[PDB]
Amino acid sequence: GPEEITADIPNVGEAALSKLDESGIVYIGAEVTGGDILVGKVTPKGETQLTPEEKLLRAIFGEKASDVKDSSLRVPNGVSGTVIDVQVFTRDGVEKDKRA
Amino acid sequence: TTDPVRMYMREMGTVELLTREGEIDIAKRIEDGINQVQCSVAEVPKQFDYLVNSMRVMMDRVRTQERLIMKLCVEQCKMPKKNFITLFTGNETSDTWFNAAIAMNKPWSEKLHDVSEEVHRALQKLQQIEEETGLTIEQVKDINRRMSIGEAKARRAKKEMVEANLRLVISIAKKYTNRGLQFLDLIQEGNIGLMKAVDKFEYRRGYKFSTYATWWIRQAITRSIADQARTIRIPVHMIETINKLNRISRQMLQEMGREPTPEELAERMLMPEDKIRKVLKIAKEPISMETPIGDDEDSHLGDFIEDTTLELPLDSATTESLRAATHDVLAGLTAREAKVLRMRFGIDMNTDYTLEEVGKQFDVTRERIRQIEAKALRKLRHPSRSEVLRSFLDD
DNA sequence: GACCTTCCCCTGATGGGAAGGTTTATAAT
DNA sequence: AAACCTTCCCATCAGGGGAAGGTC
């Protein structure tokens, strides 16, 4: 299925998603460093299988698995700059999000 | 020259062209052969072929009994071939020729008695055909012989027919050359259609064979392209759709000035618009992994491709550590709970088991098990027992 | 208490459709 | 490229039944 730019990403903390808008794009002017997520994206992945040791965790803490992987525009490792421009190209027929 | 395309282009020069009498008289030879077959049928090509094959089947049935009796009376009994043919020619129906050969009283004459038992029943198979096909065992053979002659006439005439007009196949194939398919492939796929045209042409319609051969060869080349060009084969009608879309977008260039709006093709074309984007997304062709890369260097596209099926060792080590941690943790609970957890889940076991599956061999069925799990997970939910495992869940 | 009508699950029954095949005649080498 | 036709495979619709609900 089509990928998503939603800010809702699995396996991430709040300190990381603090720097993204409702659509999941880094705020203009906010300075970042390597590892930070600039554009949150999630590619749909399926047929997840777990070693019974991990299904045990799924049963114990109730932390359910997600049906989507993680591809994100994260700052290249070693460089730390400041966002000066953000452009959004939306295809035809694809509904325009808030940031767009 | 060396290439085989030259060995073909200059080989077909030995066969001269035919027009216009040649066409008609070689077609008459073909029709004369098939007309020899037609009288032989007396005693749409689709049913005609079954009739032909049925005659052939009858002759095979007769020849089977022939060779069986022959092996029995010559190989297994040592009678001379002449003494077999002379006595067997003429009757081929009754057992009258066997008793005479016995009465011959030569040394082999005794071994006939033993194969008489084995030949009598083989002869009944052979004779029954007469009551089926209303013919004698000899007329079958004669009819088949004449019809084979007809086939031979048709064969020689048709091979000459295709050899004569071979050049037209190249004349047609040179138009299509560059469609991801090699040249000889095109000319051969056209020769196939040329043969199919030869077999389905009436020389009496008065038209020139050029037109019919042209139609058939053109179809046999275009459809063959659709079949064998793309590495990922595409349904035959989809290639037609792609060609139509490309033709429309080509024609509208000078109309729109630069290129047409996508929604227009859905208008110009018969198809609604939502499929056009799928038809354009489908057309992408594979890129050779040997494609040179930036800087025009030796690096190629077949290099920058990682392997993503693999799991990084940083995660396999964590898998093993979780294995060990849960192994130490499950031992902290009771033996009942340990077995229940290693059963409902596939821990240290062949496979996972369901509720009644676990309850089957635990002496107390479903609900009991449901009460143990929810309790054990509760007993492990508590911190001071879940910290080492809690370190494994990060979100 | 039965009767008339009602509310949901398996056999397959099928119109729908994608993939496939055979023809096409002015002449055309 | 079009033109009408056959085999195979869908993922869905008329039909049946096993009971189920509600009422003069």
From Swiss-Prot, chain A:
The RNAP catalytic core consists of 2 alpha, 1 beta, 1 beta' and 1 omega subunit. When a sigma factor is associated with the core the holoenzyme is formed, which can initiate transcription. The rRNA transcription and antitermination complex (rrnTAC) consists of RNAP, NusA, NusB, NusE (rpsJ), NusG, SubB, ribosomal protein S4, DNA and precursor rRNA; S4 is more flexible than other subunits. In pull-down experiments interacts with CedA. The lineage of its organism: Bacteria, Pseudomonadati, Pseudomonadota, Gammaproteobacteria, Enterobacterales. It comes from Escherichia coli (strain K12). It comes from the Bacteria. Co-administration of salinamide and rifampicin or salinamide and myxopyronin suppresses the emergence of resistance to both antibiotics. DNA-dependent RNA polymerase (RNAP) catalyzes the transcription of DNA into RNA using the four ribonucleoside triphosphates as substrates. Resistance to the antibiotics salinamide A, salinamide B, rifampicin, streptolydigin, CBR703, myxopyronin, and lipiarmycin can result from mutations in this protein. Acetylated on several lysine residues in the presence of glucose. Coiled coil: none annotated. Belongs to the RNA polymerase beta chain family. This is DNA-directed RNA polymerase subunit beta. The gene is rpoB.
